[PDB]
Each structure stands twice: as structure tokens, then as C-alpha cells.
Amino acid sequence: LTYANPSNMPSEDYKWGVRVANLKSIWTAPLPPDTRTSENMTTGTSTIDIMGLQAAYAKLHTEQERDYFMTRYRDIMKEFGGHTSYDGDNRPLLLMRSEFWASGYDVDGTDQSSLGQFSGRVQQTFNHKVPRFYVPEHGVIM
Amino acid sequence: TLAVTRFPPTHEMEMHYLVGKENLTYTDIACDPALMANLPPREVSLKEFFHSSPDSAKFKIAEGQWYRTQPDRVAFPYNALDGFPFYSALPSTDLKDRVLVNTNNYDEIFQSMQLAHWNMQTKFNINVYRHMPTTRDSIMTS
């Protein structure tokens, strides 16, 4: 999202915020669309290079990995056994994360017409704790 | 019983492969395990290792060999100095010759010499146990 100014983002993207991804299903987490279903190695007319073939496989491997898991530098790095500071790739630092399921209770209708009818009331008490944190430089915590 | 005196192959003009080969590709600089572990030996020239050497004198190296090793390094201030047991001259275009040591490139390291490059004075204390006649029983027709 290379939006320059909020006056550039879709009305509802900046009203309620941009759309997050659905929870992993089979159809809701397809393989990367640019995912190769085949790979050609230009061969000779009546011979193939047994050693070239080998190599062909080594390259496709490196490609496949980038496609499926290391689409991120910080990611192609980690698989090298190294690490990259959130300062190497200018990524906001995730300080804390809370997740929970919100619930509530049903309200029973009791008049002549809506007796046997209910309305679910979702009241969920939650709490989130961001442990003390040392701010290296000036910035915002979102 | 034979002797052989040698000096480590320190040339005054050997350059680090990666620093002598101009454009660095992903394969040369990343040291991707998958790659190094799976393509043919690389044919290189005395030119990717020595500062003036012909593009034409080739030899086959193992991919990523430049990452398993490190040449010795001799400052230019030296290559103009006789008295240092180093390799001044350039290699020998030819494989063989440029491996089996080039003795002559050590002539300049010594002062005067009618005792070659090296001389030795040793007392060979041998002891053989036989079943020999004897000194008197051989000269004793008897």
C-alpha cells in the first residue's frame, strides 16, 4: 500500500481501515499465484546434460523457497541462519499481541409476537498488557 | 633417504578471487548451500587470481572454493624487494609447471651461493643386525 496521503486511500479503507486477511482455510490460503507448476530446462536436440540438469534443480529450489516462504529479505536471511534488525528492513516492531474470542448471551423476547425469539448480546471483557518497553528513539506506539 | 626444502606458495600478486572477478553475481557472493552443493566445477583463469595474468591460462576450481579459503597478502611495497622468500614472478600459464614449485624464483632471496639454496651436515647413525660372517673368518682361508 503505497498510498501517499490518506486522501489517496479508498473511502472505506480509511474510514474503518484496510481489509485484513481471512483465517486460514483451504481456499482462503492458496499457494502463491505466481507459483510455478513446471520448469523447463532447455535441452539439446538429442542429448541432455546430466550435470546441467542437476544444477537446474538447484536453481529452481532457491526460486521455490523465495516463492513459498522467503518473499521477505528479513526472511531469506533468517534461512541463512542470520538475523536482521527491524532497523535493517524498516519494519514496525511488534511489541505486544493479544488475541481472544468475544462472546455474550442471548436475550429472550417475551411479548405476544416475539416469544420464542432471541437476540445474541456479545459483551466481552478483554485486557491487554504491553510490558514495560525501552523506547530507543523518538516515535509513535500504535 | 631423501630431503625436500620448500616455502609456502606466497606470491606477491595474488588477489582474492571475489576481488579480482569484476561483476559479483548471487552465486559468487551469497554462498547459498543449495547452489554450491549442486553445480559443476568452475573453470577459472590465472586472471581471476593474479593482477596481470592472461585471461587464457585456465584451471578448474570447486564452486564456493573462494569461501573455504584465504590467500596470503603481500603489500606492493614488497614486490620490489629481494631477500623475501616469496613468489615474485607470475604463475606459469601451464597447469603442471605452475603447481610443482618454480624453484628459480628464490634465487634472488640469497646473497652469494656456491652451496646452492640450502646445505646440510648430518651424522647418519645406522645400526643393522645381520648374520654376517666376520672380519677375520673371511680373510682367514682357514
UniProtKB/Swiss-Prot annotation, chain B:
Subunit details: Pentamerizes and interacts with H protein, G and B pentamers to form 12S pre-assembly complex. By binding with protein D, induces joining of twelve 12S complex to form the procapsid. The procapsid has an external scaffold made of 240 copies of protein D, 60 copies of the internally located B protein, and contains 60 copies of each of the viral structural proteins F and G. Upon genome packaging, interacts with protein J. The mature virion is composed of 60 copies each of the F, G, and J proteins, and 12 copies of the H protein.
Segments forming a coiled coil: none
Organism of origin: Escherichia phage G4
Purpose: Assembles to form an icosahedral capsid with a T=1 symmetry, about 30 nm in diameter, and consisting of 60 capsid proteins F. Upon virus binding to host cell, one of the spikes dissociates from the capsid and the virus interacts with LPS through the exposed EF loops on the F proteins. After the genome had been ejected, the channel formed by the F proteins at the unique fivefold axis remains open.
Domain of life: Viruses
Family named by the database record: Belongs to the microviridae F protein family.
Lineage, opening ranks: Viruses, Monodnaviria, Sangervirae, Phixviricota, Malgrandaviricetes
Protein name: Capsid protein F
Full protein: residues contained: 286 to 427 of 427
Cell location: Virion
